[PDB]
């Protein structure tokens, strides 16, 4: 119970969040108005009963040592349909089934390879079949490049697109990744399913309802 | 994994024949890592040590008719409930819940 649930502080930064908590070891602020600060020690982790409602850039930030403000990597991409946000798809990319495609989706969300889903759009979206995007080269599913080159093989097809928010590596799998909102067992054996959005399944359903008639692009994304 | 299996069987025989496997890892490493609990082979090493201890306990014979009686005892020592749950889930969807007739209220 060393992590906090500090909210009420997008204008804040990690240094401004950790300056009040300094010996904080972890400080990961969410894309919404929430952050979690964790101290390594035991006496320094009791900041909720010690510096609650602390002033963070002329704003009070109440700190509670809980997990109310919120392994397989989670590609958390605020997928925006058009100029408005269609929801934050926190697609838990299944590293237990397809770890290479899950790491490719997580790196495309985090934009650590120079290109990826942070800013790309899904130009191959079908109604309750597939929504394929992540290609940052041609922006149509006909470009894209994986970590091994332009084209990479699928890792494993142990998972299946059996429900909403299930993510697969679209194609042979380069930078193309497909989110599924329904059953896609007919395409099994060709696209390796590498995700299941426990959070952002409503965002995947909104992306499937919008898909393309609208520019469904995740401008903000990360791990 | 024949060499690892033979080394684990030798470590289990040295343990069940309780300080030799601990002394060998301290005296010499990666080959003597089967006694640690961080790996997943600790339950298999404990089962092999228990099998070696049960072999050394009777070191007697087994005179098991009696083998068929033991097979019947091991035979003697869900689906209807799942089918009833599926039928109830079909019936709750097939029954109209919009026709609410009030008898009591709370």
């Amino acid at each position: 119970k060393r992590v906090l649930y500090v909210g009420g502080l997008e204008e804040v930064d990690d240094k401004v969040l950790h300056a009040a908590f300094i010996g904080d070891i972890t400080d990961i602020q969410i894309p919404l108005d929430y952050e979690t600060e964790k101290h390594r020690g035991f006496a320094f982790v009791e900041f909720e009963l010690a510096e609650d409602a602390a002033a963070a850039i002329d704003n009070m930030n109440e700190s509670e040592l809980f997990g109310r403000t919120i392994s397989n990597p989670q590609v958390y991409m605020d997928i925006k349909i058009g100029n408005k946000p269609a929801g934050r798809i926190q697609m838990l990319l299944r590293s237990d089934v397809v770890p290479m495609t899950a790491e490719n989706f997580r790196c495309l969300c985090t934009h650590e390879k120079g290109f990826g889903f942070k800013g790309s759009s899904f130009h191959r979206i079908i109604p309750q079949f597939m929504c394929q995007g992540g290609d940052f080269t041609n922006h149509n599913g006909t470009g894209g490049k994986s970590i091994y080159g332009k084209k990479f093989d699928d890792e494993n097809f142990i998972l299946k697109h059996t429900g909403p928010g299930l993510l697969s590596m679209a194609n042979t799998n380069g930078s193309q990744f497909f989110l599924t909102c329904d059953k896609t067992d007919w395409l099994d054996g060709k696209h390796v399913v590498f995700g299941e959005v426990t959070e952002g399944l409503d965002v995947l359903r909104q992306i499937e309802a919008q898909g393309p008639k609208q520019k469904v692009i995740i401008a903000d994304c990360g791990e | 994994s024949a060499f690892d299996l033979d080394v684990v069987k030798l470590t289990a025989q040295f343990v069940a024949r309780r300080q030799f496997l601990t002394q060998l890892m301290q005296k010499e490493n990666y080959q003597f890592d089967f006694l640690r609990p961080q790996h997943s082979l600790f339950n298999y090493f404990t089962k092999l040590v228990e099998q070696y201890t049960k072999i050394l306990i009777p070191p007697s014979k087994l005179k098991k008719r009696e083998v068929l009686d033991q097979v019947c005892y091991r035979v003697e020592w869900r689906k209807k409930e799942e089918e009833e749950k599926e039928k109830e889930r079909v019936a709750y969807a097939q029954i109209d819940w919009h026709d609410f007739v009030v008898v009591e209220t709370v």
């Binding site: 130009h123 191959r124 979206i125 079908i126 079949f129 597939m130 394929q132 149509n140 599913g141 006909t142 194609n171 042979t172 007919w186 060709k190 | -």
Partner: protein, 78 residues
């Protein structure tokens, strides 16, 4: 499956445009995209009978990524 049922398109990506996309990606020996007796128009959702079962699988895998007449083309084994 000698035929790949290719759909996910519109009337602009018809049977003949599906034959053109077959000449692009993976060839279709015949086209089964019939219509009604009152309409008489190819919707494009038709069984392109390919050159082989592997050619129909190539239509189902490689050629099922086109934005055919604005919609994403999807071919299945038939």
């Amino acid at each position: 499956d000698a035929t790949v049922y290719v759909g996910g398109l519109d009337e602009k990506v018809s049977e003949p445009l599906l034959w053109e996309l077959f000449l692009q990606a993976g060839p279709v020996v015949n086209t089964h995209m019939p219509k009604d007796r009152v309409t008489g128009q190819h919707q494009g959702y038709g069984f392109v009978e390919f050159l082989s079962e592997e050619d129909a699988d190539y239509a189902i895998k490689i050629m099922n990524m086109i934005k055919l007449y604005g919609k994403p083309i999807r071919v299945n084994k038939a």
